[PDB]
């Protein structure tokens, strides 16, 4: 499958039980689409 | 026991030209190279052919 990374995994107690850490390489490299509407144009502007 | 260091350093600076310092590594490799020596000498190939 595309859009799916993989790594060896260390523990962290500080984040949450919900949340998961994501290293910078996965963040900067894992992409997903976002439609652009009236009210989040500002965010996508900053993004690009 | 104590750290053999002065022997280590003196073997490092000028390697021993007499005999390989740690003989038991050779006695560990002994099986293979002795089988091959027994190939060449001690008449192994000759008997076969």
């Amino acid at each position: 499958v595309n859009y799916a990374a993989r790594s060896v995994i260390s523990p962290d107690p500080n984040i949450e039980t919900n949340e998961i850490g994501v290293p910078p390489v996965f963040a900067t490299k894992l992409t997903y689409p976002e439609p652009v509407t009236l009210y989040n144009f500002n965010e996508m502007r900053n993004a690009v | 026991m104590s750290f053999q260091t002065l022997e280590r350093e003196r073997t490092f600076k000028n390697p021993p030209k007499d005999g390989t310092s740690f003989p038991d590594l050779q006695k560990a490799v002994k099986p293979h190279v002795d089988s091959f020596n027994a190939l060449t000498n001690a008449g192994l190939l000759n008997y076969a052919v």
Partner: protein, 49 residues
Amino acid sequence: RCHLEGLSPAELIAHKEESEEMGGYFIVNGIEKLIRMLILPKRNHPTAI
């Protein structure tokens, strides 16, 4: 049948092997291949099955 048997570690470091070279490996294309020892039934000893 090699040119290193009995050579004292000085004559080894003067060549390009490491002092306590142990030898025992056939070299093939540069990847030192070796014959694992296997285990066989006992020689000549008439056993039951």
